[PDB]
């Protein structure tokens, strides 16, 4: 297996905690957030078969980032990833998205065709959702949370000179979907589409994990978050948080 690489998180990962309107205030919130200036892991897909799709822990929430030039990247979430338990499948088809919750039997290499080669059997289906697709080079960022019997997705998409490090700037992730599923999640995996040879590509992504922390957020007159500070980052920010 290829060695892992790390990159600085910078000021990324801030999302809207709740659904309440706040304008021209400063609010202190204790919630699950990505700590500032943390190290995140970086996954490559480089061409005795290649194993570039590991199975990773979910913990208490996941921050996912992709900088793909073309669309190679859906997801699988679950506990056992077999037929003994239920799993969540998200697939981004060319025209529509499909979200399903069933008992699946997933293959050893769940790849896609540029289609249903992800599972051999799917029984006991208890959820099904179809909607618009989630969609130069662009940076697409997602935050996945699983709390009180609800799966919450937050998304952001920003058009991009140097791609070596994640950009230094502030942007807030906006709510996308709140699925009312009731399953337990401890593992997750990513799906890659392989074009048939007459297969790899520039598929790189970043994964990070959230922690319980207290943040101070600034709201503007229109309800948009403009600045945020981490209380436990440094002694200088402690004075600002204490007030």
């Amino acid at each position, epitope marked *: 297996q290829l060695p892992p690489a790390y990159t600085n998180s910078f000021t990324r990962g801030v999302y809207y905690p709740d659904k309440v309107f706040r304008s021209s205030v400063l609010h202190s919130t204790q919630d699950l957030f990505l700590p500032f200036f943390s190290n995140v892991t970086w996954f490559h897909v480089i061409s005795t078969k290649r194993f570039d799709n590991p199975v990773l822990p979910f*913990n208490d929430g996941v921050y996912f980032a992709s900088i793909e030039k073309s669309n190679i990247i859906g997801w699988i979430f679950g506990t056992t990833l077999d037929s003994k338990t239920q799993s969540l499948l998200i697939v981004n088809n060319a025209t529509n998205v499909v979200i399903k919750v069933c008992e699946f039997q997933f293959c050893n290499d769940p790849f896609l065709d540029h289609e249903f080669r992800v599972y051999s059997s799917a029984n006991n289906c208890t959820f099904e959702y179809v909607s618009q697709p989630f969609l130069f080079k662009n940076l697409r960022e997602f935050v996945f949370k699983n709390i009180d019997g609800y799966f919450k997705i937050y998304s952001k998409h920003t058009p991009i000179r140097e791609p070596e490090d994640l950009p230094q700037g502030f942007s807030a992730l906006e709510p996308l979907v709140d699925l009312p599923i009731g399953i337990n999640i401890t593992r997750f995996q990513t799906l890659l589409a392989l074009h048939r040879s007459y297969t790899a590509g520039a598929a790189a992504y970043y994964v990070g994990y959230l922690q319980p922390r207290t943040f101070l957020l600034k709201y503007n007159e229109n309800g948009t978050i403009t600045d945020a500070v981490d209380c436990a980052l440094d002694p200088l920010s402690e004075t600002k948080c204490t007030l």
Partner: antibody
Amino acid sequence: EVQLVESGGGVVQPGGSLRLSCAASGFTFNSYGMHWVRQAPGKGLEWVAFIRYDGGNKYYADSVKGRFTISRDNSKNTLYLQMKSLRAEDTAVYYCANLKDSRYSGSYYDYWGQGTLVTVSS
Amino acid sequence: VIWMTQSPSSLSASVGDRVTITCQASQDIRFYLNWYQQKPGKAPKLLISDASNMETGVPSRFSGSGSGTDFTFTISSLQPEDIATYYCQQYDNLPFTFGPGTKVDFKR
């Protein structure tokens, strides 16, 4: 590849204290929970303590409860075991473990260390 | 707390003989069980996870089944490199628990 190395073994008088360190290399250490495992000379396997990915919640067995402490230093990729009020029944060989579990720590791979011997005698 | 029991304690078998080991629990743990294998002077190695799922590289001769309280481990043909001690571990509820162990030898 993946490598776990333990250090701190040796001889301790009864009533003493000791500290065992464990270093991880080759894999993302800050995304998993970790376990301490001990094996007596000529006996079976036993489970000592468990720590989560960000410190926080810590779990101890009933035999080593109230006199053992577990901690992690994530900056240097290190795991610690602090042992107090030792007695002669703790003579064993200790390993650091990353155990595969579909519940709690959702690790898909399992790794073990080399081992260190701790002997309690006068 | 959960108690774990294995049977038999010590076993001896000849080449080409099917071997069966049993593990029992104090309470229901569903299919959250692991089977290990250790040779003298070396760290253990994991063979079967979730009481039915094997792992990459494990030869096809090994198998495992069972559910609830009773679980079973099976070897079809005993190649010379199968002298070790096997343990069953539960992870349904913290604290975890290992089993006593079963030893396997060759007969003459």
